């Protein structure tokens, strides 16, 4: 999130605010050019190790001065804090080299892996004040300027990008033997497979903005969350046509397909703009606004899975087609322990991210946005499995019926 903080220094406020989850040993260059001019500047900065989670990300840009109420005193605050209060007779002499060295820590190089927040503030003794000296606040740790809130997604983002490159080279492989067996559900499968790559390939590319520029484009992650979404949607779309049994069951199902596909958009209309919601960093009352619908949404939907998987299962049983109902009946087992284990994580990370009155190890906060990624890429590797080409499978996927 623009961990180069290019704030120029202005007259509205004097209080700049920095609080985030750092390596240690991680350095904080402050950059100051600005237009010299001839007034006293009294700078304090303060670099306290927050050992609890809520202290910094809870905190808010509100209650700064409150924050520092608290520290003075020690009320309600753990740790370690190191501070300076350096100051500078006119503007001028702010420009000259002033190469920052630490003073001493009170129980910047930084002394551990820990959550710390920074506050700088500038007193004054107007318009051209306003916005002088463009302070960069510019965060540089041993592997760049990447900090651990962002470390292990980049890595998990890695490994799950050859895991689809691992897939898509599998799924060529497997189609470069046979193409006059394919039917329209092995284009979409393909369809969903090059929707992850392109998804996870700009979402990594945004990624590798953030540590080598250093810089954060907001339009690369409203286009990898909406990728994400297209692709999610497609995929769960693809799940009720095949529960309704395309061709099995009827050729054409016409206005409910035209139904199904219209639940999809609606689907889409709700949760693509929730997941736009999470890019832009929505605030407290829309980001508790949007989960309803989207929980709703997923209960409704899968529940409706379970009908029509249940019906056609009923119907298959009926059909007496052996091997297609070993598969169908693996497609059920897959879809029960997906379910079961989607549920299972949804109410561990989700309840134990909040009931907890302090977030006290923070280290493994990046399964929660990847942990959903994780299972819905072994539900796609489950289905090629299922799904893979044969000699027979002219007969085993599709009946005339």
């Given at each position: 999130?623009?961990?180069?903080?290019?704030i120029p220094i202005p007259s509205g406020k004097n209080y700049f605010?920095?609080?985030?989850?750092?390596?240690?040993?991680?350095?904080?260059?402050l950059k100051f050019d600005g237009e010299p001019c001839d007034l006293s500047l009294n700078i304090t900065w303060y670099?306290?190790?927050?050992?609890?989670?809520?202290?910094?990300?809870?905190?808010?840009?509100?209650?700064v001065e409150?924050?520092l109420?608290?520290?003075?005193?020690?009320?309600?605050?753990?740790?370690?804090?190191?501070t300076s209060s350096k100051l500078f007779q006119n503007c001028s002499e702010l420009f000259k080299t002033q190469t920052f060295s630490?003073d001493?820590?009170?129980?910047?190089?930084?002394?551990?892996?820990?959550?710390?927040?920074?506050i700088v503030h500038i007193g004054i003794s107007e318009n051209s004040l306003s916005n002088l000296f463009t302070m960069?606040?510019?965060?540089?740790?041993?592997?760049?300027?990447?900090?651990?809130?962002?470390?292990?997604?980049?890595?998990?983002?890695?490994?799950?990008?050859?895991?689809?490159?691992?897939?898509?080279?599998?799924?060529?492989?497997?189609?470069?033997?046979?193409?006059?067996?394919?039917?329209?559900?092995?284009?979409?499968?393909?369809?969903?497979?090059?929707?992850?790559?392109?998804?996870?390939?700009?979402?990594?590319?945004?990624?590798?903005?953030?540590?080598?520029?250093?810089?954060?484009?907001?339009?690369?992650?409203?286009?990898?969350?909406?990728?994400?979404?297209?692709?999610?949607?497609?995929?769960?779309?693809?799940?009720?046509?095949?529960?309704?049994?395309?061709?099995?069951?009827?050729?054409?199902?016409?206005?409910?397909?035209?139904?199904?596909?219209?639940?999809?958009?609606?689907?889409?209309?709700?949760?693509?703009?929730?997941?736009?919601?999470?890019?832009?960093?929505?605030?407290?009352?829309?980001?508790?606004?949007?989960?309803?619908?989207?929980?709703?949404?997923?209960?409704?939907?899968?529940?409706?899975?379970?009908?029509?998987?249940?019906?056609?299962?009923?119907?298959?049983?009926?059909?007496?087609?052996?091997?297609?109902?070993?598969?169908?009946?693996?497609?059920?087992?897959?879809?029960?322990?997906?379910?079961?284990?989607?549920?299972?994580?949804?109410?561990?990370?989700?309840?134990?991210?909040?009931?907890?009155?302090?977030?006290?190890?923070?280290?493994?906060?990046?399964?929660?946005?990847?942990?959903?990624?994780?299972?819905?890429?072994?539900?796609?590797?489950?289905?090629?499995?299922?799904?893979?080409?044969?000699?027979?499978?002219?007969?085993?996927?599709?009946?005339?019926?």
């Amino acid at each position: 999130d623009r961990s180069k903080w290019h704030i120029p220094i202005p007259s509205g406020k004097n209080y700049f605010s920095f609080g985030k989850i750092l390596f240690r040993n991680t350095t904080i260059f402050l950059k100051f050019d600005g237009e010299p001019c001839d007034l006293s500047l009294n700078i304090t900065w303060y670099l306290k190790s927050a050992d609890c989670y809520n202290e910094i990300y809870n905190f808010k840009a509100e209650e700064v001065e409150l924050y520092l109420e608290k520290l003075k005193e020690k009320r309600g605050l753990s740790g370690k804090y190191q501070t300076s209060s350096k100051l500078f007779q006119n503007c001028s002499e702010l420009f000259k080299t002033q190469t920052f060295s630490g003073d001493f820590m009170h129980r910047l190089q930084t002394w551990q892996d820990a959550p710390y927040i920074f506050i700088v503030h500038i007193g004054i003794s107007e318009n051209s004040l306003s916005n002088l000296f463009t302070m960069t606040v510019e965060v540089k740790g041993p592997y760049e300027y990447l900090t651990l809130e962002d470390y292990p997604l980049m890595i998990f983002f890695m490994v799950m990008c050859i895991v689809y490159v691992l897939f898509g080279v599998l799924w060529l492989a497997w189609s470069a033997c046979y193409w006059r067996d394919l039917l329209r559900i092995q284009f979409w499968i393909g369809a969903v497979i090059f929707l992850g790559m392109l998804e996870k390939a700009v979402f990594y590319a945004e990624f590798q903005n953030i540590r080598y520029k250093g810089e954060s484009v907001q339009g690369a992650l409203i286009l990898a969350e909406l990728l994400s979404a297209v692709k999610r949607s497609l995929a769960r779309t693809l799940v009720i046509i095949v529960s309704l049994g395309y061709g099995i069951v009827k050729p054409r199902l016409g206005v409910t397909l035209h139904k199904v596909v219209v639940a999809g958009a609606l689907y889409l209309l709700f949760s693509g703009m929730e997941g736009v919601l999470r890019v832009t960093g929505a605030q407290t009352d829309l980001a508790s606004l949007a989960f309803i619908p989207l929980a709703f949404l997923d209960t409704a939907l899968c529940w409706w899975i379970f009908i029509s998987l249940t019906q056609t299962m009923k119907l298959l049983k009926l059909r007496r087609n052996i091997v297609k109902l070993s598969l169908y009946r693996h497609f059920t087992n897959t879809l029960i322990l997906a379910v079961a284990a989607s549920i299972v994580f949804i109410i561990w990370t989700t309840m134990k991210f909040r009931i907890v009155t302090c977030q006290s190890d923070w280290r493994e906060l990046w399964v929660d946005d990847a942990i959903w990624r994780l299972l819905f890429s072994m539900i796609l590797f489950v289905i090629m499995v299922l799904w893979r080409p044969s000699a027979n499978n002219q007969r085993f996927a599709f009946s005339p019926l």
